[PDB]
C-alpha cells in the first residue's frame, strides 16, 4: 500500500483566512494526486486532480500543487461552502488510497448554550423506563461539560451524549445528554440536575427539575 | 447531466451476502471504469474495487479479496458488488464512483447506499413526546423534544410537523447503546406558538415499517 499521510485532522479557521491542508505519499506517484471534498449532506465532488488542475467549476481560490512528495491544497481566503471535509487521493498504483482527512470547522465567536431540562414522559414511565432528557442548545466552542446529579450525588453510569455538527447557519453546536433510569430507581429519588459546564461563563449552567404532586 | 445512483443496502447478518447496484445515466458506461469505495459509519473513505470498462482487469482492495466480486451490465448501464462473507467491517455507506481520471475529464461520485451487517435483528423505536413543563430556554422561547428510543437499524426519518416546521429543529444523531439506537430531536418555537399551536413528532423507521405521530401536549 501507498500510505498517503494527510494533515492537519481538523482545523478551524476564520472566514477570509487561508489554509494548507498537507499530502504527503509515500512513494512516486508522479502526481497523480486528487483532492475530493465531502460536504455534511455526505455528497462527494472533486476539487483537484493531476495534483494541481482545478475541476469546472471549483473557484479559483482553490489551488493544488507539489514539492517533492509532499501535496499540498491551499484554500486562500475561506469564505462558507469551504465548510467540509477533505480527502486527498492518489490514483497513481493499484491498491488506490485515501489521505486520512481534515475537518474544517468555522471559528465563531463565543456562545453559551441554552439548556432545557425535560423530565420522563408518562408513556415511558409506564414502559418502566425513565429517561430524563436535557439538551444544550447553540453553543460555541464544542467544548462542553455535562454533569448529571440526581438528588444531591453525581451520577455517570447512564448517561447517553450526542454532539451535532456545526450548524449550517449559526456555526454552533448542540447537545443531548439522556440520563436512563428504571421507572423504580426514579421514582425513588427526587431531584434531577442537568449541570453543565462551558468556557462562555465560569458558573455551572444549572437547569434541574424536581418530581413530586404535578 | 451525469448521475450514479447506488441501491442494495440493508441489515445483514454476519457470514450473510448483499448484491448492490450502482445505476449510471449521462455518460457512455461503457468506456469508463468504474469503482466501489466505501465510508464506515464515522471514518474516511476507502477503495474497494476496480473494473475496467471491458470487464477485463479487476482489481480489489486487501481487505475485500475474495469475499467481494466486482461486475457490470454495460448495456444496462449497471455496475454490481457481489458481497460474501459480510462481517461486522463490512458495515459502511458504499458509494460507487465513475473513474479513468487519466484524461477522463469529469469526476462523477455517487450519493452511497447504506449496508449494515450486525447479528443483531430489527427493531421498531418507541417515541416519547418531551413536553416542557422545564424546556425553559429564555421564557420568550418554549423548547420542545422527542424522544425515539430503542430501534435498530438505521436510518429513521424524524420530522417536526410533517415537514411544515423545519425551523428551529435541532436532531441529533443517533447513538448504539447495546444493541440499539436512541436519537432525539430538539425545536424551537416563540411561547405564543405553543401550545396554541399544535407540533408534532413524526418518526418513521423505514426498515421495520414503523409511522408514528406525537402531539407534544403540555403537562409534564
Ligand atoms: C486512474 P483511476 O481513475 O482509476 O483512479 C481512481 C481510482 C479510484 C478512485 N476512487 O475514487 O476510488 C478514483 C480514481
Ligand atoms: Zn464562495
Known amino acids: 500500500q501507498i500510505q498517503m499521510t494527510q494533515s492537519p485532522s481538523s482545523l478551524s479557521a476564520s472566514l477570509g483566512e487561508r489554509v494548507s491542508l498537507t499530502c504527503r505519499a509515500s512513494?512516486?506517484?508522479?502526481?497523480?494526486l486528487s483532492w475530493l471534498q465531502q460536504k455534511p449532506d455526505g455528497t462527494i465532488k472533486r476539487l483537484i486532480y493531476?495534483?494541481?488542475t482545478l475541476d469546472s467549476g471549483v473557484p479559483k481560490r482553490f489551488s493544488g500543487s507539489r514539492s517533492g512528495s509532499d501535496y499540498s491544497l491551499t484554500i486562500s481566503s475561506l469564505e462558507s461552502e469551504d465548510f467540509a471535509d477533505y480527502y486527498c487521493?492518489?490514483?497513481?498504483?493499484?491498491?488506490?488510497?485515501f489521505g486520512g482527512g481534515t475537518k474544517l470547522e468555522i471559528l465563531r465567536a463565543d456562545a453559551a448554550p441554552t439548556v432545557s431540562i425535560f423530565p420522563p414522559s408518562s408513556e415511558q414511565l409506564t414502559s418502566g423506563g425513565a429517561s430524563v432528557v436535557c439538551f444544550l442548545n447553540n453553543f460555541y466552542p464544542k467544548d462542553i461539560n455535562v454533569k448529571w446529579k440526581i438528588d444531591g450525588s453525581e451520577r455517570q453510569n447512564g448517561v447517553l451524549n450526542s454532539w451535532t455538527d456545526q450548524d449550517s447557519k449559526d456555526s454552533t453546536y448542540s447537545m443531548s445528554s439522556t440520563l436512563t433510569l428504571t421507572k423504580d430507581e426514579y421514582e425513588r429519588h427526587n431531584s434531577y440536575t442537568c449541570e453543565a459546564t462551558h468556557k462562555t461563563s465560569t458558573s455551572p449552567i444549572v437547569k434541574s427539575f424536581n418530581r413530586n404532586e404535578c | 447531466d451525469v448521475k450514479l445512483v447506488e441501491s442494495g443496502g440493508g441489515l445483514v447478518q454476519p457470514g450473510g451476502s448483499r448484491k448492490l447496484s450502482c445505476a449510471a445515466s449521462?455518460?457512455?458506461?461503457?468506456?469508463?471504469?468504474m469503482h466501489w469505495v466505501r465510508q464506515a459509519p464515522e471514518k474516511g473513505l476507502e477503495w474497494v474495487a476496480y473494473?475496467?470498462?471491458?470487464?477485463?482487469?479487476?482489481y480489489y482492495a486487501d481487505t475485500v479479496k475474495g469475499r467481494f466480486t466486482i461486475s457490470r451490465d454495460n448495456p444496462k448501464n449497471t455496475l454490481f458488488l457481489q458481497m460474501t462473507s459480510l462481517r461486522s467491517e463490512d458495515t459502511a455507506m458504499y458509494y460507487c464512483?465513475?473513474?479513468?481520471?487519466?484524461?477522463?475529464?469529469?469526476?462523477?461520485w455517487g450519493q452511497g447506499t447504506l449496508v449494515t451487517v450486525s447479528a443483531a435483528k430489527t427493531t421498531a423505536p418507541s417515541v416519547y413526546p418531551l413536553a416542557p413543563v422545564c424546556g425553559d430556554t429564555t421564557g420568550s422561547s418554549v423548547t420542545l423534544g422527542c424522544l425515539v428510543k430503542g430501534y435498530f437499524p438505521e436510518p429513521v426519518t424524524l420530522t417536526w410537523n410533517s415537514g411544515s416546521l423545519s425551523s428551529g429543529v435541532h436532531t441529533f444523531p443517533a447513538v448504539l447503546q447495546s444493541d440499539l439506537y436512541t436519537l432525539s430531536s430538539s425545536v424551537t418555537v416563540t411561547s405564543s406558538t405553543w401550545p396554541s399551536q399544535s407540533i408534532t413528532c413524526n418518526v418513521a423507521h423505514p426498515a421495520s415499517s414503523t409511522k408514528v405521530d406525537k402531539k407534544i401536549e403540555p403537562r409534564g
Open positions: 464512483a465513475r473513474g479513468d481520471y487519466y484524461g477522463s475529464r469529469g469526476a462523477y
Open positions: 449521462g455518460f457512455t458506461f461503457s468506456s469508463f471504469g
Open positions: 473494473i475496467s470498462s471491458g470487464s477485463s482487469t479487476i
Open positions: 512513494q512516486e506517484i508522479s502526481g497523480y
Open positions: 493531476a495534483a494541481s
Open positions: 487521493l492518489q490514483y497513481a498504483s493499484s491498491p488506490y488510497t
